[PDB]
Amino acid sequence: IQRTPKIQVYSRHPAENGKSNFLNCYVSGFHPSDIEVDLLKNGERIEKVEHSDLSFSKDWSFYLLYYTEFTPTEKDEYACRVNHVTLSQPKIVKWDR
Amino acid sequence: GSHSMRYFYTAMSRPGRGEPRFIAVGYVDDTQFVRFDSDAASPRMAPRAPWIEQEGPEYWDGETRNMKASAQTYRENLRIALRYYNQSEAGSHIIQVMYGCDVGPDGRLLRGHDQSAYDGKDYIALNEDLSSWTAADTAAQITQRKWEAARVAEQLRAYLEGLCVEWLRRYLENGKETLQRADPPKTHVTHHPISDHEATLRCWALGFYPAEITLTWQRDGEDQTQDTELVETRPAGDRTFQKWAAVVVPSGEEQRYTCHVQHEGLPKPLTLRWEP
Amino acid sequence: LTVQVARVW
């Protein structure tokens, strides 16, 4: 009856410190559609993240892309935090270049 | 090559939190071009691709009216489905519908599609003949009898063979710079030791459109399907997609592995290897 | 262009 989200965190372009880019969290394969997704910068929630319009795959499972502009640096740590009815507690997936 | 138009409707009830939300999105191939969201401050069919923007007020008003009518229809269908499955009025439930047409290079109808689900499970589907239905359970058989009595299949067939193909062809022409351009993947192989005697080789494809791609690892010329980690193709946000495939190999054997890439944007399949 | 067909379940 319920399907847990797959989560990928990644950038729009290969990352280069000091160069503007987009940070993406793609959540997919989940059902039902309600989902809570935050992008984190050093553990803190980034404000006014955008997301795509809700759509779904041939197997009926939903997908959404959450994204925000960012300028990566050697020091800053980025992550995506997802909650869904299938998850006991929020799942955190760290951005790995 | 060949092209598709697909609409996707999601109707989600939320008892105690107002009427069900209805969201519709339309795609040509892997390019979204319209959306409607009943929760928007001002719900209307709205453009999501530059080539649809040239459609006039009659188009947008017509689509907005149709999406409001559809939202009303699907709110009612959620009530109906509660009765068909003997469910309480306290739960949240979802109806989904996807429909559209596929055309070949010559613009001719290859096939039509119309499929509906309830709570993420198949409910009822129009068969490829566009004249009969496949109902997934006894509830959907009730719906099937209603649709047969009302000749719904004939109406959809008329749509799928007519307006669907005509409008798809129109969109393909108006958006030909993008909808009819394949961007091939930019590919490379990375290598990272995980221990003194194994390494990961990861074959990357970036910046490609459309989303369909095949990435496979071979060892000594044999596909390593069972042993390959493949991530889901993911959107970059600039229309293009990304994907990778990884295999764990014994240290010193890296050159026995080759990554093979097939994509519409490529004249021929690519073979690549780790280049230290 | 979307379909206009009544689909009452």
Check which CATH number belongs to the domain holding B253 and give it: 2.60.40.10
Q: What's the CATH number where B60 sits?
A: 3.30.500.10
Q: Which amino acid is at B64?
A: T
How do strand B222-223 and strand A21-30 relate by DSSP bridges?
Answer: unpaired
Mapping DSSP to helix (H, G, I), strand (E, B) and coil, where does residue A45 land?
A: strand
- Count: domains in chain B: 2
| Residue B195 domain boundaries | 182-272
DSSP string of B98-164, one letter each residue = EEEEEE-TTS-EEEEEEEEEETTEEEEEE-TTSS-EEESSHHHHHHHHHHHHTTHHHHHHHHHHTHH
Closest residue by Cα to residue B84 from C8, A32, A1, A56: C8
Residues B59 and B106 in one domain: yes
Q: B11, exposed or middle or buried, with CB in 10 Å at 0-12, 13-18, 19+?
A: buried
CA-only gyration radius of chain A, Å: 14
Yes or no, beta carbons of A55 and B235 under 8 Å apart: no
Mutation target among B25, B36, B66 for the C interface, most CBs of C within 10 A:
B66
Residues B66 and B199 in one domain: no
Residues B164 and B27 in one domain: yes
Mapping DSSP to helix (H, G, I), strand (E, B) and coil, where does residue A9 land?
A: strand
Phi and psi dihedrals of B70, rounded to 5?
-60, -40
Contacts 24+ apart (CB under 8 A), B19-22: B19/B75, B20/B74, B20/B75, B20/B78, B22/B67, B22/B70, B22/B71, B22/B74, B22/B75
Resolution number, Å: 1.8
Residues B187 and B171 in one domain: no
Mapping DSSP to helix (H, G, I), strand (E, B) and coil, where does residue B20 land?
A: coil
CB atoms within 10 A of CB B221: 7
Q: Which of B160, B181, B202 is the last residue of a domain?
A: B181
Yes or no, beta carbons of B120 and A1 under 8 Å apart: yes
Residue B149 contacts residue B163 (beta carbons within 8 Å)? no
Residues B199 and B114 in one domain: no
- CA–CA gap between residue B62 and residue B121 (Å, rounded): 31
For chain C, the distance separating the N- and C-terminal CA atoms, rounded to the nearest angstrom, is 23
* DSSP run (H or E) holding A41: strand A36-41
- CA–CA gap between residue B30 and residue B257 (Å, rounded): 31
Q: What is the 3-state secondary structure (H, E, C) of A15-35?
A: CCCCCCEEEEEEEEEEECCCC
CB atoms within 10 A of CB B196: 7
DSSP-assigned letter for residue B206: E
- CA–CA gap between residue B258 and residue B245 (Å, rounded): 11
> What per-residue string of b and e applies to C1-9 under the rule 16 or more CB within 10 Å gives b?
bbbebebeb
Residues B164 and B191 in one domain: no
Q: Which of B164, B181, B198 is the last residue of a domain?
A: B181
Mapping DSSP to helix (H, G, I), strand (E, B) and coil, where does residue B228 land?
A: coil
Residues B158 and B190 in one domain: no
DSSP string of B152-202, one letter each residue = HHHHHHHHHHTHHHHHHHHHHHHTHHHHT--BPPEEEEEEEESSSSEEEEE
Using a CB-CB cut-off of 8 Å, the residues of chain C touching B76 are: 8-9
Residues B30 and B139 in one domain: yes
Residues B155 and B265 in one domain: no
- CA–CA gap between residue A66 and residue B99 (Å, rounded): 26
Point out the residue among B23, B25, B234 whose CB comes nearest to the CB of A10. Answer: B234
Residues B64 and B164 in one domain: yes
| Domain range annotation of chain A | 1-97
Q: Which of B150, B166, B181 is the last residue of a domain?
A: B181
Could you tell me the fold of the domain covering A1-97? Immunoglobulin-like (2.60.40)
Q: B225, exposed or middle or buried, with CB in 10 Å at 0-12, 13-18, 19+?
A: exposed
* Token reading at B237: 């946000």
Residues B243 and B132 in one domain: no
Distances (CA, A) of A68 to A75, A80, B55, B211: 18, 11, 30, 22
Chains B and C touch (3+ CB pairs under 8 A): yes
What's the length of chain A?
Answer: 97
Q: B222, exposed or middle or buried, with CB in 10 Å at 0-12, 13-18, 19+?
A: exposed
Yes or no, beta carbons of A56 and B35 under 8 Å apart: no
Experimental method: X-ray
* DSSP run (H or E) holding B66: helix B57-84
Using a CB-CB cut-off of 8 Å, the residues of chain B touching A35 are: none
